[PDB]
Design an enzyme around this catalytic site. Structure first.
Site, PDB file in Angstrom:
ATOM      1  N   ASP A  37      -6.723   4.193  -3.816  1.00  0.00           N
ATOM      2  CA  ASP A  37      -7.466   4.990  -2.862  1.00  0.00           C
ATOM      3  C   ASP A  37      -7.173   6.474  -2.975  1.00  0.00           C
ATOM      4  O   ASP A  37      -6.363   6.895  -3.810  1.00  0.00           O
ATOM      5  CB  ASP A  37      -7.335   4.437  -1.433  1.00  0.00           C
ATOM      6  CG  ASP A  37      -6.008   4.749  -0.749  1.00  0.00           C
ATOM      7  OD1 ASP A  37      -5.210   5.585  -1.252  1.00  0.00           O
ATOM      8  OD2 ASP A  37      -5.780   4.134   0.332  1.00  0.00           O
ATOM      9  N   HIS A  58      -1.585   8.037   0.331  1.00  0.00           N
ATOM     10  CA  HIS A  58      -1.878   8.016   1.781  1.00  0.00           C
ATOM     11  C   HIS A  58      -2.822   9.165   2.145  1.00  0.00           C
ATOM     12  O   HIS A  58      -2.682   9.851   3.169  1.00  0.00           O
ATOM     13  CB  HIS A  58      -0.570   8.080   2.596  1.00  0.00           C
ATOM     14  CG  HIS A  58      -0.636   7.418   3.948  1.00  0.00           C
ATOM     15  ND1 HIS A  58       0.025   6.243   4.223  1.00  0.00           N
ATOM     16  CD2 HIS A  58      -1.238   7.789   5.101  1.00  0.00           C
ATOM     17  CE1 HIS A  58      -0.195   5.901   5.484  1.00  0.00           C
ATOM     18  NE2 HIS A  58      -0.940   6.835   6.046  1.00  0.00           N
ATOM     19  N   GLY A  82     -11.500   5.588   3.145  1.00  0.00           N
ATOM     20  CA  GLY A  82     -11.005   5.905   4.486  1.00  0.00           C
ATOM     21  C   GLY A  82     -11.892   6.858   5.224  1.00  0.00           C
ATOM     22  O   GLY A  82     -12.801   6.448   5.960  1.00  0.00           O
ATOM     23  N   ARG A  83     -11.635   8.149   5.031  1.00  0.00           N
ATOM     24  CA  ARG A  83     -12.332   9.184   5.790  1.00  0.00           C
ATOM     25  C   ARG A  83     -13.862   9.040   5.860  1.00  0.00           C
ATOM     26  O   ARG A  83     -14.404   9.160   6.960  1.00  0.00           O
ATOM     27  CB  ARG A  83     -11.922  10.572   5.351  1.00  0.00           C
ATOM     28  CG  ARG A  83     -10.496  10.914   5.709  1.00  0.00           C
ATOM     29  CD  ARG A  83     -10.122  12.270   5.138  1.00  0.00           C
ATOM     30  NE  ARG A  83      -8.725  12.658   5.289  1.00  0.00           N
ATOM     31  CZ  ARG A  83      -7.750  12.454   4.375  1.00  0.00           C
ATOM     32  NH1 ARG A  83      -7.980  11.787   3.237  1.00  0.00           N
ATOM     33  NH2 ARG A  83      -6.527  12.941   4.597  1.00  0.00           N
ATOM     34  N   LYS A 135       0.821  -1.195   0.000  1.00  0.00           N
ATOM     35  CA  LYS A 135       0.000   0.000   0.000  1.00  0.00           C
ATOM     36  C   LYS A 135       0.862   1.255   0.000  1.00  0.00           C
ATOM     37  O   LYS A 135       1.680   1.453   0.912  1.00  0.00           O
ATOM     38  CB  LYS A 135      -0.946   0.019   1.224  1.00  0.00           C
ATOM     39  CG  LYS A 135      -1.729   1.303   1.386  1.00  0.00           C
ATOM     40  CD  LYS A 135      -2.761   1.172   2.491  1.00  0.00           C
ATOM     41  CE  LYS A 135      -3.626   2.401   2.563  1.00  0.00           C
ATOM     42  NZ  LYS A 135      -2.982   3.575   3.196  1.00  0.00           N
TER      43      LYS A 135
END
Ligand code: FMN
Ligand code: FMN
Ligand code: FMN
Ligand code: FMN
Lengths: 334, 334, 334, 334
Positions: free
Chosen positions: A260, A229, A283-284, A205
């Site tokens: 992502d 990231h 994610g968020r 990742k």
């Protein structure tokens, strides 16, 4: 009744303390890479196909030997008890129920064994520790607990400079800890040590360079996540979505290629798929849903995303994710 | 005295209930495709020709065996009684008087036979029903009533997610109904069933992929409308105007190639023509005129567009629409 | 003490009645071409040269057999008494004193013979009249009065749709008239009629298509002005500055190639020169200076432009306008 | 505790008199080149490498025969006593302590011998004087005082038109003087005169054209600074960062290639390096730090930049500046 992922951000902003919201929302430096993740997606337009058979539209994929309900997994986000008291257990439960893989973090605020016990399709995200032996013991724990892939984060030789956190003087509350414990920069040798110590697929990742994607395949990775990231590491790093097409061509099916950064709708999932991604991480938004309404909030988010993905696929003439990968795209402006 | 189409939007906003204005104005998702329709037109600049003979400037075209006064038709817009009590009859009358084809909708709020009785050049827009037999009976009704083309909408396997309508809880008032009645996804087999059951030209509305345009020609379509459904279907679908040049080259005169989405002036009609379109459809502006002032409003809109089209053509050195199609263009910024 | 051309616009706005300011400032339609003239210049960056001999920097050029002090002429602007009581005489006097050609308009508010009597380097701008005989008599008058070139405007088959003027109901005051009098679309035959009836160089103003530039040379034009008429004619016409490089290559020295639209500084003059222009026309800024302070205002404007042109040339390492034409450029953003 | 260079600008704005802040901040003309320096950097994204050995990350370089702690030097900025009473001595001391070269100006407000006496790695910036003999005596003074390179500024045949300064009527206070004294345009002959009169490396500052870079190498320059003088000279000059890649390819290691203009973070230094720069100059930010807090302010700025450079390099997988030069980049939007 949330009708977009943006409804959940507004709700999370209202409930969370500002410094915690900033820990979640922020990026490194000037936040150029954070913003660019969104800008890049907004530039992509899909060329939909018409008049195809949609009698059996399915959003399912097979990835790392398991069926997933959507071409999506919950991204590793550290310290989820920051956002809700149930933390990782609330998120993992909702992910399980939705048929979506959940990535358990090295820096989880509930132990990896407790989260894995929830069931579902847990993956485990690795940060490389001080010495090979502790790193490998963490991998072994994850494998013993039934995790199905090791997501080795490779873009954190150290943590980036998050200026919101520096300005806020942000620190973990005493009631949030790294529950897997009572770090050093990873290299290709570290990857090999992990690959040699597990039968699980190793997923790297934080890959952005085409030659790093090729080398990941040569190194025996089962997948990569093309990622900056969330704009939290190098400020000025290219968005993953902008490297994805080149990377997909270069690996030419040698490993799964995930992406992502800024995925905020089923339409964005479709864009990622059309650019060649096997699946996305989110994610968020998952954390906004957690903050807003705990497990039920995450369930509602995943239900909304599932509907948006099915809607987008069908409108684009795709009865399967494989078909969506064969869609063409066109870059536009603003 | 309206001097631009934007004068009519302001007037419609004042008179219409907010939820109805939103039904009309809105798009799906984040409205990215809605906005992009306008952005894309604004990027196109025309390279006008000078010093040509303009003694007999004409905006007329022949399309589907009939003369039209302008290279324009009124787009299918469902439920026009939402906007004015006379609904479709007011619009069809004004279109007739202006020499512009009017597209009668499957979801018209006045029956297709009543609207066709107005006269003029009616076309009929088809949504594919539950079973072949009812769909074909609707086509037969339209043909029996004197409609001159079947505009088969191919970008609606189901309706898109219009978030303004969801947030408003929008529903048809009791006084607006689908007057053609007391749906299923279309495929290429559906197109063939329609083509086999009528002598009218079949026009596929909602084509964006080049290979779908080619296949439309191979399928016996008399035309296509290159369209993202006004940004109401797939959010992130490319604007039709951005695919038009490629599509025109690929069909190489095998069918009429129309475009829609964001046409708001005679200058925009000229841009569409210069990119290769046979004609445009205009949707929302016609409804603004209807809302603002009924039949007379639509007449004034069509008169304004007619003047703007003639002005733009002549200023660009084009005595005919065919000449406008031979104009070159250059892409600019903002 | 004005330090930029923008100082003069603010001054003109304060003094002029709004409807007159709008007549001056406005463009056709949505003003897309008006804005694009500025946008296009702002995208151009010059690649300056260093360390060249600047002992004898000169901004002079030879054009149509006469020396000019700068690579610039005052553009034709109709009805200059709208802006100041002395109108064209104030502007022509200041132009004469600055060594800059002044273009006398067909629609001048002082007779062409009176303006030519001022002296200097007058050119005459022609709009084609109702019949060949009156048009040619106007050309003969201009030639008899000592005008040195005929600037035949070729982008006005009729006047564009200036919506500010329509909204304002703008009309000439009774005290402003077309002083050359007590129109029809021009064609290539009209150009030939003019070329056959005068020994003066014929300059075609309003060329944008490359093939029209070539045909202008073939037709015996001594020059062209690459121009969209300040965004006042076709709304959506490409800016002249965007066609200039292609046009300069195509005519390959066969006639003088001028440009106009949005020139607002000596730096902009340098950009135009670097793109290949022989000279520029400047319109609106001259009228701002006239409105602000009459003849003295125009003198100050021309002095400011002269200083900015010399400054820009020298900073870019150009001792002559010919050298500036050999500069390279690079397109940027915003 | 400043966490970005932008913290220092806010502090300098509060303390400095407006006219002095404007002298520092401003550019020439419309400030198009000033803004473009920032825009251009913001368009560049880095493609970071992962999983490399970072055990011995070093930001050091060798340049003009001396080690520097960072790939950075303090740009020549005239009259530093404008910003703080200690002026150049405060800046030179902080630069020395940080291991960063300091460029002493021809127009320094403390004599070059006093500044050189501070120690460190002083360079000397030359403006060409009235006659060869005085210019060369200035070079000899600098060499005698222990300066290690001559930075010959080649983009100032005369000073640009800084409209903020003209509007403010800005003049040096009586307490600030050109301390090296009790100018004419440079040419290639001037460069040769300097090269013949010193053993120090001659560095030509203000090169933008590729052929000027090549000619600089042919002329015996040890380096160039690819620069538009912070947007203070030709308004509309291309940013140096936009020419850098082409220039680096053309000189193909024949001299050191530095860049300046808008460097405001370690991430920006990384971008410059990835585009091929040997090192950067930083101007305005050093003066903000000086204004805010004197020598200590400049120390804090240089410490912050050092941390940001190390952070950015490591995050991008670069153990050395040479490795950073081998990074690839991708252009994005806004
Ligand atoms: C608060 C926060 C914590 C994170 N923690 C981790 C982590 O421990 N390990 C990791 O590999 N990525 C971590 N990430 C990065 C995410 O996995 C993901 O790459 C990033 O958030 C981009 O996706 P987004 O725009 O959907 O948030 C974190 C991101 C956020 C916002
Ligand atoms: C309120 C509304 C209703 C619509 N109804 C239909 C319909 O029933 N069938 C159809 O094919 N298109 C329908 N459309 C799409 C239009 O035909 C057209 O493609 C779209 O409005 C783009 O054009 P515009 O920007 O000119 O509005 C509708 C659009 C609107 C705004
Ligand atoms: C108020 C006004 C009147 C004009 N009148 C004429 C005219 O009579 N003939 C002509 O060829 N151009 C005319 N023009 C166009 C100018 O010659 C020139 O092409 C245009 O203003 C672009 O330059 P600018 O941005 O420097 O104003 C006029 C422009 C303005 C603003
Ligand atoms: C106030 C000021 C004074 C300057 N003085 C000089 C000078 O005397 N000599 C020189 O070569 N450059 C001079 N420069 C240009 C700088 O060396 C540098 O090229 C420019 O500031 C771009 O960098 P920045 O964005 O980091 O400020 C000056 C710049 C400023 C802002």
């Amino acid at each position: 009744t949330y009708v977009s992922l943006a409804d959940l951000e507004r709700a999370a902003r209202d409930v969370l303390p500002g410094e915690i919201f900033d820990f979640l929302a922020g990026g490194s430096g000037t936040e150029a890479s954070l913003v660019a993740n969104r800008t890049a997606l907004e530039r992509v337009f899909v060329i939909p196909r018409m008049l195809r058979d949609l009698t059996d539209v399915t959003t399912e994929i097979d990835i790392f030997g398991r069926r997933a309900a959507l071409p999506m997994a919950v991204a590793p986000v550290a310290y989820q008890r920051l956002f809700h008291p149930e933390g990782e257990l609330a998120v993992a439960r909702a992910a399980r129920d939705a048929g979506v893989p959940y990535t358990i973090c090295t820096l989880s605020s509930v132990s990896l064994e407790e989260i894995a016990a929830v069931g579902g399709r847990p993956w485990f995200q690795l940060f490389w520790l001080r010495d090979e032996k502790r790193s490998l013991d963490l991998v072994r724990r994850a494998e013993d607990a039934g995790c199905e892939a090791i997501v080795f984060t490779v873009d954190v030789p150290w943590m980036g400079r998050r200026l919101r956190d520096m300005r806020n003087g942000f620190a973990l509350p005493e009631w949030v800890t790294a529950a897997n414990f009572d770090f050093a920069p990873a290299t290709w040798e570290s990857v090999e040590a992990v690959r040699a110590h597990t039968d699980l697929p190793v997923v790297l990742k934080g890959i952005l360079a085409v030659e790093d994607a090729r080398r990941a395949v040569d190194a025996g990775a089962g997948g990569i996540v093309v990622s900056n990231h969330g704009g939290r590491q190098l400020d000025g790093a290219v968005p993953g979505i902008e490297m994805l097409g080149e990377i997909v061509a270069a690996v030419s099916g040698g490993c799964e290629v995930l992406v992502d950064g800024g995925i905020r709708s089923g339409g964005d999932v479709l864009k990622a798929t059309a650019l060649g991604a096997s699946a996305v991480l989110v994610g968020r938004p998952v954390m906004w849903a957690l903050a807003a309404a705990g497990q039920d909030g995450v369930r509602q988010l995943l239900e909304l995303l599932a509907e948006e993905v099915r809607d987008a696929m069908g409108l684009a003439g795709c009865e399967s994710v494989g078909a969506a990968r064969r869609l063409n795209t066109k870059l536009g402006v603003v």
